[PDB]
């Protein structure tokens, strides 16, 4: 008996930004979804498609863990069918996404003096993003009709922008850690089940 390492992606020491969010698939273990809901340390535990209490019986063939840090007033944008500058340029959920999302506040680890400018998000982009797709790039977004040669000036700007993750901010500006669990069901039999 080998329990699934869901506490590895949850109690990690180095999370990722929203434009370069990490992803690794968990397989060949028995899941323990009871202690996650009964942990009493999370803020928003909502599902989309599956009942949140019916996880331990109806099982899936592969699970994905997408971990990234966003603001407090933008955790609603990670939901099936929402708009906003985070939901369309960094991370988009489709309509048929049959998984559960889970978020919690991370103020006691990602808020120090001086300001945390390491967490970066994408503000400018050419078009919207397809669901479940990341775009690591440093290409200058040409906003006006001037072709600039990768320089910083008028009508073309840098696409990334740092976060003001200072501990003196309001409760809506605190950095929030969110993990996306995507239960995908194939015609092949399941592997993580229990």
């Amino acid at each position: 008996t080998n329990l699934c390492p869901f506490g590895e992606v949850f109690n990690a020491t180095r999370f990722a930004s929203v434009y370069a969010w990490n992803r690794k698939r968990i397989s060949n273990c028995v899941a323990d979804y009871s202690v996650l809901y009964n942990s009493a340390s999370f803020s928003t535990f909502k599902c989309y498609g599956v009942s949140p209490t019916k996880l331990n019986d109806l099982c899936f063939t592969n699970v994905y863990a997408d971990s990234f840090v966003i603001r407090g007033d933008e955790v609603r944008q990670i939901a099936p069918g929402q708009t906003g500058k985070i939901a369309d340029y960094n991370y988009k959920l489709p309509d048929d996404f049959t998984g559960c999302v889970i978020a919690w506040n991370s103020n006691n680890l990602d808020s120090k003096v001086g300001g945390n400018y390491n967490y970066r998000y994408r503000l400018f982009r050419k078009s919207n993003l397809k669901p479940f797709e990341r775009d690591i790039s440093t290409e200058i977004y040409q906003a006006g009709s001037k072709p600039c040669n990768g320089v910083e000036g008028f009508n073309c700007y840098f696409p990334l922008q740092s976060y003001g993750f200072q501990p003196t901010n309001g409760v809506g500006y605190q950095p929030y850690r969110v993990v996306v669990l995507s239960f995908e069901l194939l015609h092949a039999p399941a592997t993580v089940c229990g």
Partner: antibody
């Protein structure tokens, strides 16, 4: 229908300051970049500067640095140009524009023009 | 900055005639130039952008060619509505430098 409506003609004394408006309707005002120009009587055209409504970045001409400033009012979708230290050389018309880069263009899409004359 | 020179300033072509409006650049502008049309008293409207493409609502007889230094706005079948003021702009380096201007006339 995309429509740019400007103000009326203003008679002004030398040394004063005016505010020329260009109301916008029919498109998304936040993304598209707005330019401002100046056409003197009988001579060639000249460019002043451009302002970006989503950010606020400005890049004026070097001959109009201490001449004109630009402010954008997103609450009513109205841009403004404020001219300072007017002399007799500013007997010109002033147009507003609109960039067109997210439509595969190089468009300016000029407005109407405000005839601003100077006299004592 | 870029000095956009137009020569000459006056041109006289009758109706049903081919006319060519040219203007030069100082440095390597590339491809991104423009052309406009200004009725006397009215506001200027856009005709040609990036020296190969028209706009939405302009006639198809306004064609353009040339790259690098020389640019030409050639009109095939001119009309009475063709009489206007034609300018040329660049989009290479800020600030934008407009041209001089060329006025059309009817031969008599």
């Amino acid at each position: 229908e995309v429509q740019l409506q400007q103000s009326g003609p203003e008679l002004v004394k030398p040394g004063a300051s005016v505010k020329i408006s260009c109301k916008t309707s029919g498109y998304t005002f936040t993304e598209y970049t707005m330019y401002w120009v100046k056409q003197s009587h009988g001579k060639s055209l000249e460019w002043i500067g451009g302002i970006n409504p989503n950010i606020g970045d400005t890049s004026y001409n070097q001959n109009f640095k201490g001449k004109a400033t630009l402010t954008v009012d997103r609450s009513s979708s109205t841009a403004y140009m404020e001219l300072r230290s007017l002399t007799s050389e500013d007997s010109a018309v002033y147009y507003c524009a609109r960039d067109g880069y997210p439509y595969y263009y190089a468009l300016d899409h000029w407005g109407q023009g405000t005839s601003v004359t100077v006299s004592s | 900055d870029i000095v956009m020179t137009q020569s000459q300033k006056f041109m006289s072509t009758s109706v049903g005639d081919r006319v060519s409006v040219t203007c030069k650049a100082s440095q390597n502008v590339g491809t991104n130039v423009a052309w406009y049309q200004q009725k006397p008293g009215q506001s200027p409207k856009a005709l040609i952008y990036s020296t190969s493409y028209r706009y939405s609502g302009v006639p198809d007889r306004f064609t353009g060619s040339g790259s690098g230094t020389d640019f030409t706005l050639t009109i095939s079948n001119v009309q009475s509505e063709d009489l206007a003021e034609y300018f040329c702009q660049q989009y290479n380096s800020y600030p934008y430098t407009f041209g001089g201007g060329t006025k059309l006339e009817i031969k008599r």
